[PDB]
């Protein structure tokens, strides 16, 4: 409610005071009352990369005709005044034994865009399994063969085109894979301008009505920042009010803990203000 102008006055003023950060610290991380059962079953415990980052039952991604569990959540951000919904699947970095289910989600829904917001390793520890092959190798995951047909590094991210072939049926599917490598776990992007350019590039690569698969290591911190920013960009361009706290709450009603740290929330709120101001015309 209110207007874009008033919401940005409210955000700038509350950044200054700073009531914006206090209200973020007050927000629940996990919505009370939402069941989390499947994620804790004995056969599924080691399918979670982190013990405390689990999908709600209501928004858990199911594999079509397949009972295998995956730690993945549907996250949809509605902009109702624009009759717009931005769909995501937010998931963790696959483990060695969950690559099969990851690629099954991609196949089931013919997802043509994967956004990976992590390096494979940090400080000697593995943060994500390499679920694609180094070109020109071909990888087998759960009855999909994967090959990387193109790989180009920019400054901040790597752009890969991947071919997914179904071993059972012979069909093929192509996926664009963006790996943002300049953004450490529980941190902010190394460069804010690279981040914003990357978010707007992701927006431009959206296919109509198709979820973007977004993941990091846990799939909540850096993913939450990106989702918040894309939502805010859509709201700014449509002259609609932006309440970052409402956005984070809406995400957290669908996948717990989205936007991990106060620094990450402060970063995205400042970025939102920046975008609004440098786009503002008298």
């Amino acid at each position: 409610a209110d207007t874009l102008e008033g919401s940005m006055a409210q955000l700038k003023k509350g950044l200054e005071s700073g009531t914006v950060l206090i209200q973020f610290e007050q927000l629940y991380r996990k919505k009370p009352g939402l069941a989390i059962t499947f994620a804790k079953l004995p056969q599924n415990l080691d399918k979670n990369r982190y013990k405390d980052v689990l999908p709600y039952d209501t928004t858990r991604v199911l594999l079509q005709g397949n009972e295998d569990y995956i730690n993945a959540s549907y996250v949809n951000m509605e902009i109702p005044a624009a009759n717009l919904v931005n769909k995501y699947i937010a998931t963790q970095g696959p483990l060695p034994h969950t690559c099969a289910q990851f690629w099954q989600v991609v196949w089931d829904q013919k997802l043509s865009l994967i956004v990976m917001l992590t390096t494979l390793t940090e400080r000697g520890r593995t943060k994500c399994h390499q679920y694609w092959p180094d070109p020109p190798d071909v990888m087998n995951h759960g009855g999909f063969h994967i090959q990387c047909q193109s790989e180009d590094c920019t400054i901040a991210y790597v752009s890969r085109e991947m071919l997914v072939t179904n071993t059972q049926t012979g069909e093929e599917h192509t996926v664009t894979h963006l790996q943002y490598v300049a953004w450490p776990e529980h941190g902010v992007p190394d460069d804010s301008s690279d981040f914003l350019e990357f978010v707007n590039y992701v927006r431009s690569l959206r296919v109509d009505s198709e979820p973007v698969l977004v993941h990091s290591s846990a799939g909540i911190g850096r993913t939450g920042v990106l989702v918040t920013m894309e939502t805010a960009m859509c709201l700014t361009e449509r002259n609609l009010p932006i309440y970052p706290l409402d956005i984070v709450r809406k995400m957290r009603d669908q996948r717990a803990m989205m936007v991990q740290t106060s620094s990450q929330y402060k970063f995205v709120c400042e970025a939102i203000l920046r975008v609004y101001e440098e786009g503002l015309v008298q």
Partner: peptide, 7 residues
Amino acid sequence: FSAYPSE
């Protein structure tokens, strides 16, 4: 099984 680290 360990928690997602925080800073």
